[model samples]
Target: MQIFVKTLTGKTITLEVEPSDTIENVKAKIQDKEGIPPDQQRLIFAGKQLEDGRTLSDYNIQKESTLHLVLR
Candidate 1:
């Protein structure tokens, strides 16, 4: 599945990952691309912090779905 992540800095990055990729993995990718640390990464979907073990599918993520990430 392809996920579109929008950063707090007004940048958008799209990643093509498999169904096995966890939210933590996605967070790491965002951290790497946005030059942020894992500890400072915050991802919010549906007004809740996404758990590490949850897959995108678990959150009903679809192709080209956008996930918002904010850096602290």
Candidate 2:
């Protein structure tokens, strides 16, 4: 599945992740795309914190969903 991802720098990228992919995996992918370190990355969806090992389904994210990331 593909989702719209926004980086802390305001860069938008489309990510293709599997159904089994977790929020942490998405964070790593965003870090790879934006050249940001994993430790400084955080992803928020609908104002909720996304924890590592939590699947997209756990966050209620569907295919073609959009997620926002803020770098700390």
Candidate 3:
């Protein structure tokens, strides 16, 4: 699945991932692609705070879903 992920500052990146992927996986990707540390990133989806241990499918994360990232 693909999702639109952007930082609080700017730039939305289209990321390729699986629903089985962990939020930690996304955070790691953000750290790699956006250069934001996972520990420093707060990820929100569908008005819910995403947890590192949870799967995207567990949270029902959809394709094209916009994941909001804030650096803490």
Candidate 4:
């Protein structure tokens, strides 16, 4: 599955992922591409923080569903 990412800075980007992917995986990818660590990343969906233990599939994350990223 592909998902959309929206940064706090208002930049939007798309990422390719598997349904089984975890928040940790996404955070690591962001760290690789953008150098932001997982500890500093906040993943939000449906107006709430997403847990690292939960898979994307658990959230019913579909293509284009936005995952908002905020940095601390």
Candidate 5:
């Protein structure tokens, strides 16, 4: 699946991911691309905060989903 990670500054990062991929893994990818630490990144989807150990499928995150990124 392809998801868009949108930051506070309106920057968007596109990521290719599997449905079974954990949120923690997604954060790692973001860290690699944008240099944001995983612990400082908060991912929100469908108005809910995503958990580190939860898979994308667990949140029903499908193709072209947009996840909002907030910094702590």
Candidate 6:
């Protein structure tokens, strides 16, 4: 499956991933594609901040879901 990550400035990044992947794993993918470090990325889904240690499935993330990425 895949998901979309939107930056505050409206830049959209498409990430290819699986529900078993942890939030930090996703962050690493972002870093690989965009040069933003995992520690600098804050992912938010459905108005709630996603924890790095948590898996996507833990948040019930669906395919093509858009997560807000706030750079810290």
Q: Count the backbone clashes (under 3 Å) in each candidate.
A: 0, 0, 0, 0, 0, 0
Residues forming the 10-long window of minimal summed lDDT in candidate 4: 28-37
RMSD of 3: 1.0
Candidate 2 lDDT over residue span 1-72, tens digit each: 899977666778899998789877887887788788878877888898789878988877888887887777
**Candidate 2: regions farther than 4 A off:** none
TM-score of each: 0.83, 0.86, 0.91, 0.92, 0.98, 0.95
Candidate 1 yields a Cα-based lDDT of: 0.80
Candidate 6 weakest lDDT stretch, 10 residues:
34-43
Worst 10-residue lDDT window, candidate 2:
4-13
Candidate 5, residues 1-72: lDDT per residue as tens digits? Answer: 799999999999999999999999999999999999999999999899999989999998989999999999
Ranking by TM-score: 5, 6, 4, 3, 2, 1
Pairs of residues at least 3 apart in sequence or in different chains that clash in candidate 4: none
lDDT of 4: 0.88
Q: List the candidate 5 regions with Cα displacement exceeding 4 Å.
A: none
lDDT per residue as tens, model 1, 1-72? 787878777888899877677988887887677667778877887787888879877887788888788777
Least accurate stretch of 10 residues (summed lDDT) in model 3?
5-14
lDDT of candidate 4 over 1-72, digit per residue (tens):
778889988998778899899989988888887888799999999988998888899988888798899899
Off by over 4 Å in 4: none
Quick one: best TM-score, which candidate? 5
Q: Model 6 clash pairs?
A: none
Worst 10 residues of 1 by lDDT: 29-38
TM-score, prediction 5: 0.98
The sequence of per-residue lDDT tens digits that candidate 3 reaches over residues 1-72 is 899887766978888999999999988887788687789888888788888999999988888889887777
TM-score preference between candidates 2 and 6, better one:
6
